[PDB]
Amino acid sequence: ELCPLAEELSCSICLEPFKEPVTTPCGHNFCGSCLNETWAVQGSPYLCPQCRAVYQARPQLHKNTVLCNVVEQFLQADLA
Amino acid sequence: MAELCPLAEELSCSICLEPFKEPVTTPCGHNFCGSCLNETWAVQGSPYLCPQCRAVYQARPQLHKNTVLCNVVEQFLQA
Amino acid sequence: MALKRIQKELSDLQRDPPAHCRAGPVGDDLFHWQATIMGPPDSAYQGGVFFLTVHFPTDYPFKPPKIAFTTKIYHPNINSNGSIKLDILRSQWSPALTVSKVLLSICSLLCDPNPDDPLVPDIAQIYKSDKEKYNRHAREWTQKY
Amino acid sequence: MALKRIQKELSDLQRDPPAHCRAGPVGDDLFHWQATIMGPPDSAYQGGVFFLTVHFPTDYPFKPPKIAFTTKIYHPNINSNGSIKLDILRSQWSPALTVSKVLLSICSLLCDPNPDDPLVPDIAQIYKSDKEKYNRHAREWTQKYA
Amino acid sequence: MQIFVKTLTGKTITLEVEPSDTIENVKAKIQDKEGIPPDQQRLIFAGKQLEDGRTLSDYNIQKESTLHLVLRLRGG
Amino acid sequence: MQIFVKTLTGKTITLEVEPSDTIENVKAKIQDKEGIPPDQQRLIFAGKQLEDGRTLSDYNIQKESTLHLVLRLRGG
Ligand SMILES: [Zn+2]
Ligand SMILES: [Zn+2]
Ligand SMILES: [Zn+2]
Ligand SMILES: [Zn+2]
């Protein structure tokens, strides 16, 4: 019954539920670790993995706290 | 369906006090309705401050709507 | 829209009962409110009850509300006209702030004034040079209102 | 870490087989796969069954997988060694891409080559000056797989 | 007439379109739901890409058909 | 030791702390949950603001107490 919510809260990089997600200015969410690991192995323009939005400087992003609380509440609903 | 009751307060915008309407997320990680944040910054020019943490943005950030967050709010409201 | 934001604030404020803060429209105009804050315990304002008026602008919450005291209070940042020189009521306003948070902010200002940039210069001077007499003066005005 | 992402891609690939391909590991090492894609339905690659090799690096999916044809194919962007010169396999790689998406992307490359920046110049030259001769050469190579 | 789009992350979304709508119109609806610009969208149906300017009838796309979304690519 | 913090949006969060923890330590844990830096936080208990560098025991904050979070202000 929580399957549409489950896919919506899954990271496009690790294919698992979001772990401390961050949101790009283009409105796309990734695990803080997954997106950091994506932009650490490269340089130059930093591109969004989902829409290839161009960022000449690496964006400084903090964790989407509302999205963290949603994932945490989703896990409880999925376990009980 | 939503096995989640406390989701309502988590999906409510801090400006309109209503569920998110096409929410955008600031680089500081705070979400607001697209219209609410644009009205905040059209009235508050010069340095643009986040309503929740006062993060300073000299140039107005270009933000698109958090599509994942839109889908969560919609599935919450349809239930 | 301002009126829906004001109604939602009042609705939550009726299930909030915040401490030291009470507010709500007395008339049928929800853009004008009457608020009462209680002086913080263990202070010169303890046991006091201070009345305030809240007038919401048409751009609320994107513009701050106009809040002023009606009870006379002894404080370097509140003059005799009840005007409150507070930054969050002007340039440091945030649309995410509610009346409950602002009244609570004003309550914490009573025991944390700013005498260096004062609204009442002479009260601030007594606060700078003799804080024991200041607390005595503030306790006297609390009983006198 | 790479192995977990590879495992989940394979399990989702086994739970639902996409119509455009069939992929899976060769033996015990899930970092080496063998894939097979079908040619587009209305082209010079009709009915063709093309085998490919998928080699995942240790830093997958943050680095793209090495994908090369083992079946011989007539294409301006695929050389005789089966190497594929494609942007999403190098600079334009995205970690959000899955092997199923890449294999489907390679399928659409067959009927949309780039003859202006080619990997095989003589094949691209035929494509530009005589596409009919190009189509028959590609049709012939699909019947022969050589 | 409803069609389905297999988005980049494997998710499936439903679109309300018409056989007269162009691919550029379809990418606009995809952009509204996923946030990826049309110039970065590459729609694939029957193993082949769908070019802008052509309609759904030009590609023989009818009721409940599924389009597949990959990122823009170029041969080399 | 469990305490409660009324965040800026009126939501209530729960923190597990100790009387030895300073106010600045509490504001760091509030930053982890709400994403507001400590220099922009102003914690209020019993109508008074809580100074950084002081501990919870110095303010007689006990179990199940409720701290209130407003934005950093400056009298004038
Ligand atoms: Zn992830
Ligand atoms: Zn993006
Ligand atoms: Zn912020
Ligand atoms: Zn809003």
Author numbering:
A (entry chain D): 3 to 82
B (entry chain A): 1 to 79
C (entry chain B): 1 to 145
D (entry chain E): 1 to 146
E (entry chain F), F (entry chain C): 1 to 76
Sentences from the paper on this structure:
The RING domain of TRIMs adopts the canonical RING domain fold that recognizes the ubiquitin‐loaded E2 conjugating enzyme (E2~Ub). To understand the role of self‐association and gain insight into the mechanism of TRIM‐mediated ubiquitination, we have analysed the properties of two TRIM ligases, TRIM25 and TRIM32, which differ in their domain architecture with TRIM25 containing two B‐boxes compared to a single B‐box2 in TRIM32.
The TRIM25 RING/UBE2D1~Ub complex crystallized with two molecules of the TRIM25 RING domain and two molecules of a stable, isopeptide‐mimic of the UBE2D1~Ub intermediate in the asymmetric unit (AU), related by a twofold symmetry axis. Rather surprisingly and in contradiction to our SEC‐MALLS, the RING domain is a dimer in the crystal with the dimer interface burying ~1,000 Å2 of solvent‐accessible surface. As observed in TRIM32, dimerization is mediated by two α‐helices flanking the RING domain. Instead, residues K65 and T67 of the RING domain contact D32 and E34 of the opposite, distal ubiquitin in one monomer, whereas in the other monomer, the K65 and D32 interaction is absent and replaced by a hydrogen bond between N71 of the RING and K33 of ubiquitin.
